[PDB]
Amino acid sequence: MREIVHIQAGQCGNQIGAKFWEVISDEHGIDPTGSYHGDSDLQLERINVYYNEATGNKYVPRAILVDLEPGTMDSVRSGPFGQIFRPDNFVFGQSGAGNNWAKGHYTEGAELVDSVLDVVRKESESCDCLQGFQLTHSLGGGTGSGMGTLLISKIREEYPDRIMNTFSVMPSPKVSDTVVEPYNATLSVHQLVENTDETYCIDNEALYDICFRTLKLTTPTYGDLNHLVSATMSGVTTCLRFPGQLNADLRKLAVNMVPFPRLHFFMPGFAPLTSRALTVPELTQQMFDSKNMMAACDPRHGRYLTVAAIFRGRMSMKEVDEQMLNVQNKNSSYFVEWIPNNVKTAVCDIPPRGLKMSATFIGNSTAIQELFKRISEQFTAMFRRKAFLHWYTGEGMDEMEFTEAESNMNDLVSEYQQYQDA
């Protein structure tokens, strides 16, 4: 359990993926040319989880960049850290996917997927002991969503005993590109329910609200949304990236977080929310606050099956333990009683850039059903009139596949509701 292979697919996937690499490269002291210039050994101890070491003490992200059009990856390559990525790990077509899951999954994506897998295989081949994969993508478009889930299936077939983890951006009318997003997201969710072990549900609804309501951003851009995402992604991978006891690899995280295989969709949260001194008590209260959650679900509307909390910075561990106990002891009703001691806490001395201390929240809450119900309602409003379906049937799909995807997502909802009441 050491190496992770990172993949980022499509426009959203690549934009947030690029930001993730910028952020953690800074945290690990790796500059845009892959040279190390940090002042702490904590930085390099587990650097091999995410980076290969090339010649000249150069560190290279174990990262594969995928798209069905070149535009966003041209931008990535021009980006500040664009030169750090391995040039042969850019795999792209020219056709685009037109926000169409069928094109990403069955036609345009089909034609490209083998070459992605050649690169993945070359990455896995140099791994001393691959843990598994993390994928960044959105569910509302065509490439990240349709081709991204195609990839996950092929990867599982080839590495069926490795962990699959995703950061999956869920669409919202509030931050929407096309009307077919609910279709692409429902089709993708069924894939995720079956073929990932752990999925961070990143809700563009939540991201927008935080930017608007909390950060006082009148007109949030995708860039502002991605600030929150990259901050969250750094937080939730801290335990994989730095020496530590708890959830230090992807399988142990799954074992701590997933009591039933399908219910592996996590609501992440972060504090303090950023666009000059925070106390452990304040971090703890803010990390559990709905307003700090990146999935637009009311956690008081459900129950926590499991929780992982990660605190970063120099702070009193005694105080951390006290505050974490205080949260559970004073709101014990929201933690299912049939999983004793279901909240685990890690502390890492290195804080993220620009903060003295911070906290990241990963919840497996039954309230996540609210996010799937929302997608399900939007899907049905259209599907009942078969609206916009020609875009999909034109790529060889039939309606039955929509009925099935819908049924399985409603099953998922019913399954959360079951443990909410147990």
Partner: protein, 442 residues
């Protein structure tokens, strides 16, 4: 002299082992490079310390120890630290990926792949013994390797060394330092499969140790290092009789004989005093009466429980330091008129007492103050079953919903193994109850 082989399994087992051998070296005057000046017989011998150490012609004293972990980072630290010279490479065994806090993964999936190797490396140690007594096995209940690989090892050890005794030092799970929600599952699975293979097991609840460190060492937030230094003192107190001249608990068999009349009920409670902070500027040294009295306080036990509401089958007192029998007997007489000490009808109310004149050794720069006298009581009391009750309840809460079970089945373990293990624990709780217990708006 008859040799004992120590086996350290998984992170808790390995790190506790590290602490113990450090302490053993200090106690016997063995240097980090393995040399032992005071040992005038170069290159061999059958002194009492040779029970735990072999010797090279170069005069190096080598722990009769094997370290096993399914991932390398913890053992790599043994290979690279102070006592790296102490151990031969073949004594330190690592895999590449761990058991992921999953008993089934440690026991079936990864266990199957490394057990023949581990056994070969133990065989090598055994072939150096002229009269192997048996095994001391250190591991956690909660980890995947600690739980799952140990049970597999213990099964096979009974097959390949059928006449040898096996003692355990086992770390019982405590949420304040634990790293997995499923630790109750792993504890119960490993206890079930190990029960028939272990002759005597000393359980240490991390909660008890944690609180002793907070309360008596004024450590605000104890680390595994704090905890392991204290555990190693207790382990040393327990094994001192195998490593020094004496006439009590002089061989592994005597542990069962003195502490375990009923084979299944083989978990003695350890109680230790005194634990004093090295930072404590002014400390009044405690008497024999005071440290003995402290053996009957729950706050000093390795497992929090209430021996007053239980019964004893046996009690041993192990002293280190300035202690003579007269004061022990005076202490006991007095304690007997105050404490509730009820033995079962079929055992004599008495104490086996061992005294080693050398006071406890403490690690330079450690948390523990040097004291003039210390004691470790080992009592086989039914009250320790409180800890099984706690575990079994947690197990029941999760298992009723099959929470996390799919992880174990996915490793090829059958679900039936959960309920079989649980049934055995139920039978075990019942056994303690029978041994230990007699028989509205008003």
């Amino acid at each position: 002299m008859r040799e004992c082989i120590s086996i350290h399994v998984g992170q808790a087992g390995v790190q506790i082992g590290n602490a113990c051998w450090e302490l053993y070296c200090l106690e016997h005057g063995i240097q980090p490079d393995g040399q032992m000046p005071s040992d005038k017989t170069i290159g061999g011998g059958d002194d009492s310390f040779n029970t735990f150490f072999s010797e090279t012609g170069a005069g190096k004293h080598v722990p009769r120890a094997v370290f096993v972990d399914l991932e390398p980072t913890v053992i790599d630290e043994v290979r690279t630290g102070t006592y790296r010279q102490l151990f031969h490479p073949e004594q330190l065994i690592t895999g590449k990926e761990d058991a992921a806090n999953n008993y089934a993964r440690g026991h079936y999936t990864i266990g199957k792949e490394i057990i023949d190797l581990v056994l070969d490396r133990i065989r090598k140690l055994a072939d150096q013994c002229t009269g192997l007594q048996g095994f001391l096995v250190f591991h956690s209940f909660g980890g995947g390797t600690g739980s799952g690989f140990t049970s597999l090892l213990m099964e096979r050890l009974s097959v390949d060394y059928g006449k040898k005794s096996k003692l355990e030092f086992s770390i019982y799970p405590a949420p304040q330092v634990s790293t997995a929600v499923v630790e109750p599952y792993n504890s119960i699975l490993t206890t079930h499969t190990t029960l028939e293979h272990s002759d005597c097991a000393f359980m240490v609840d991390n909660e008890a140790i944690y609180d002793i460190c907070r309360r008596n060492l004024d450590i605000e937030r104890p680390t595994y290092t704090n905890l392991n230094r204290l555990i190693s003192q207790i382990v040393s107190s327990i094994t001192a009789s195998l490593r020094f001249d004496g006439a009590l608990n002089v061989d592994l068999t005597e542990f069962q004989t003195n502490l375990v009349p009923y084979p299944r009920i083989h978990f003695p409670l350890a109680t230790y005093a005194p634990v004093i902070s090295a930072e404590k500027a002014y400390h009044e040294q405690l008497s024999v009466a005071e440290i003995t009295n402290a053996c009957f306080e729950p706050a000093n036990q390795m497992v929090k429980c209430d021996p007053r509401h239980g019964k004893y089958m046996a009690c041993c007192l192990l002293y280190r330091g300035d202690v003579v029998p007269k004061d022990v007997n005076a202490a006991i007489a007095t304690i007997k008129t105050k404490r509730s000490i009820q033995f079962v009808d079929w055992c004599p109310t008495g104490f086996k007492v061992g005294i080693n004149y050398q006071p406890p050794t403490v690690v330079p720069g450690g948390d523990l103050a040097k004291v003039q006298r210390a004691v470790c009581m080992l009592s086989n009391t039914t009250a320790i079953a409180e800890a099984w009750a706690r575990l079994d309840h947690k197990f029941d809460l999760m298992y009723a919903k099959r929470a996390f079970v799919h992880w174990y089945v996915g490793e090829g373990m059958e679900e039936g193994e959960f309920s079989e293990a649980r049934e055995d624990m139920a039978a075990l709780e019942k056994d303690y109850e029978e041994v230990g217990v007699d028989s509205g708006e008003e």
